[PDB]
Design a protein around this ligand. Structure first.
Ligand SMILES: CNC(=O)CN1Cc2ccc(Cl)cc2[C@H](C(=O)Nc2cncc3ccc(NS(C)(=O)=O)cc23)C1
Ligand SMILES: [Cl-]
Lengths: 296, 305
């Protein structure tokens, strides 16, 4: 029993974090095999890069200094070829996630990990993270069995306190650019499929006060959800919620009718899984994993 | 910017998790140097849990009755002893991944990271606090016994909790790493229940200071309060008494924001009276009590917005 925002064990990623310094800027890098990946803003990027030599980049892994032997740019990510392969390189993949998908973040400063937390890629492509100056180059990841899937690299903070970054191939999530200019997070929406998953998690943990005898059509549910800034629920989302619907015996469109009533009438002084807000940062898979006991 | 429930990086603890099996029971163990620490109820069956005589169950065991597995490697047990509610299994191999560590006993209101494990394999990490009633609101399923709580300061891991059981209300009870339970709990299936829980007042105040640092002051007011009058009001909402020690501990947060502790106490009094009126504080519609004054200082900026 119990429901917590749970992050993946960070050990495999901790062994990859390094400090990168170029001139007066210092941020974090990801050391995989003989390459260090970090935001290219550590340095017209092609014009700034051509003026740099290998010895201009200071890479530090713990107390050991790594020697840079080459450098190249891939989108908004700088790839520093180092002379030593990382002996702690885990099995890994670089993956691009979609809005609504969650991941763990290992927040680092000076190449040293400070904390780990869970978060979701918002529909507006920003993340509500906890980052201070020096956190650039911190990474987001998921773990499947023994393989770390790197999905995020931190690049910047937006005026509203939210965060923007790239996948590990340097392609930004969202319409953001890596420069000082007027940039703002677009209007955000609630991840509907995730709120439904978390309502199923509450039924598994014994919270059923919000259930009712009523059902709804998928179209009528979407007409109501569009009014409360909720993402449209698709037939794919309904299919994905299938195992949670089977484990609890509550049809997806019946859970949709419970959410329809909570959107109109609120919670009335009550809470769900210790929350007075409808929580959208747990995917259907996160609910299944936490209510099963999946290990790595 | 931003404020999240942040756990310590779990890597140093992951390298210590092992699987312990005694007969038909399998749970987790903590491998530090040449010793494996685990809950002593690993030697019990379900029937034994009603009235276990651990000394009598233990005397019937030999070293080879304990199966310890570190990854795919089998560790050989060469000795065993009981210390309160923990079993200490002397193994033939020292853990090469043993971090610098201490065993510390925490007080209610203190937070820590939990590495939830099943079959000696870590599955997830989360942050939580020792509640005033000595239970923890964790997320544990069957097989999680032996999972540990810890803090990491500098390169030193301070182990403070080992998971032993789930109470009827879904909350959890465990021991320090010397086997002494937190709270009036026993490692026996008895009619024991979590006592009435209360809100950790010093932590709610710390989190209100964190909201001020991150640029939010809507909840402040022009009033102050005496410490005694604040406690008379706070006890009515099931909040823990705020002591002079708590006021002293909140000093650096009071200085960084320029808001006196008893002035923040007056805002808390009003927030309890009024609720939030559709507003949130650090993305929460409830008053959050699982961030200590020390957690706020560690996570938040040293410059107020
Ligand atoms: C609620 N479980 C029980 O009534 C049985 N328990 C009795 C008992 C009594 C004292 C001590 Cl020290 C240990 C224990 C055991 C115990 O609490 N371990 C567990 C710990 N944490 C989460 C757990 C979720 C579930 C779970 N068991 S189950 C198949 O789902 O019933 C055990 C869990 C076993
Ligand atoms: Cl303490």
């Amino acid at each position: 029993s119990g429901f917590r925002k749970m992050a993946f064990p960070s050990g495999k990623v901790e062994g990859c974090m390094v400090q990168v310094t170029c001139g007066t800027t210092t941020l974090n890098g990801l050391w995989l095999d003989d390459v260090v990946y970090c935001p290219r803003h550590v340095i017209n990027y092609e014009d700034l890069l051509i003026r740099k030599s290998n010895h201009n980049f200071l890479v530090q892994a713990g107390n050991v200094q790594l020697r840079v032997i080459g450098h190249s740019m891939q989108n908004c990510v700088l790839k520093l070829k180092v002379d030593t392969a990382n002996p702690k390189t885990p099995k890994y993949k670089f993956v691009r996630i979609q809005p609504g998908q969650t991941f763990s973040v290992l927040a680092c400063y000076n190449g040293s990990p400070s904390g780990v937390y869970q978060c979701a890629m918002r529909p507006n492509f920003t993340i509500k993270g906890s980052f201070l100056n020096g956190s650039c180059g911190s990474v987001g990841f998921n773990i499947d069995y023994d393989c770390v899937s790197f999905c995020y690299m931190h690049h910047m903070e937006l005026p509203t306190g939210v965060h923007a970054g790239t996948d590990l191939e340097g392609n930004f999530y969202g319409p953001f650019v890596d420069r000082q200019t007027a940039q703002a997070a677009g209007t955000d929406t609630t991840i509907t499929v995730n709120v439904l998953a978390w309502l199923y998690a509450a039924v598994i943990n014994g919270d059923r006060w919000f259930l009712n005898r009523f059902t709804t059509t998928l179209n009528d549910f979407n007409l109501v959800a569009m009014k409360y800034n909720y993402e449209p629920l698709t037939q794919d989302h309904v299919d994905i919620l299938g195992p949670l619907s089977a484990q609890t015996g509550i049809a997806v469109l019946d859970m949709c009718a419970s959410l329809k009533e909570l959107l109109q009438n609120g919670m009335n002084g009550r809470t769900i899984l210790g929350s007075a807000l409808l929580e959208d940062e747990f995917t259907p898979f996160d609910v299944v994993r936490q209510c099963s006991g999946v290990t790595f």
